[PDB]
């Protein structure tokens, strides 16, 4: 399975997830609020690189292991991250 969301418009999603002054962020995004461990560390390690986007790792991995099409939208709404719904 591959999400294959539009990459130029995927950048907005990653940026919005990264700039998360709210205590909820990519980590709580990973907790799923109702639910595979070492790969989380490998995604976290991709912060040292200049173009480091942990959201990119957590979405490309989530693009696989289940074609998340609007399935993540419900949980994102549960995360009060309505700006995603306000945008897409």
């Amino acid at each position: 399975t591959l999400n294959r969301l539009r990459e130029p418009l995927l950048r907005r999603l990653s940026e919005l997830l990264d700039q998360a002054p709210e205590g909820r962020g990519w980590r709580r995004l990973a907790e799923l609020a109702g639910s595979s461990c070492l790969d989380l560390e490998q995604c976290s390690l991709k912060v040292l690189e200049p173009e480091g986007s942990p959201s990119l790792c957590l979405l490309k991995l989530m693009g696989e292991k289940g074609c998340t099409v609007t399935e993540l939208s419900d949980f994102l709404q549960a995360m009060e991250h309505t700006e995603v719904l306000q945008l897409l």
């Binding site: 990264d18 560390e41 976290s44 390690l45 040292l48």
Partner: protein
């Protein structure tokens, strides 16, 4: 951007007093792997002082200047011993970096 070095030094400085917890592996962590970038004489200088806590202090003092301190993180992964919660620490470490990077974006 040749500027993430600065944020890395700031992150280490902010996390200074979390060294005492698990980096009491001063002789243990760096004096073998970090010899790829450290000096033999630097090891003796570190081993000189007998505080066992100040020792890690000067270790990190040496580490701050070097642009590529991420080697320490790499070394942290290698020894699985503290890793499980050094993971915590590295997540701690990672978290700090995230915060600082955000402030750089202003």
């Amino acid at each position: 951007e040749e500027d993430l070095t600065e944020v890395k030094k700031d992150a280490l400085e902010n996390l200074r007093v979390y060294l005492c917890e698990k980096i009491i592996a001063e002789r243990h962590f760096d004096h073998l792997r970090a010899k790829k970038i450290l000096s033999r004489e630097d090891t003796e200088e570190i081993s000189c002082r007998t505080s066992s806590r100040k020792r890690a202090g000067k270790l990190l003092d040496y580490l701050q200047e070097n642009p590529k301190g991420l080697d320490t993180l790499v070394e942290s992964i290698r020894r699985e011993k503290t890793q499980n919660f050094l993971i915590q620490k590295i997540t701690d470490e990672v978290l700090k970096l995230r915060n600082i990077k955000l402030e750089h974006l202003k």
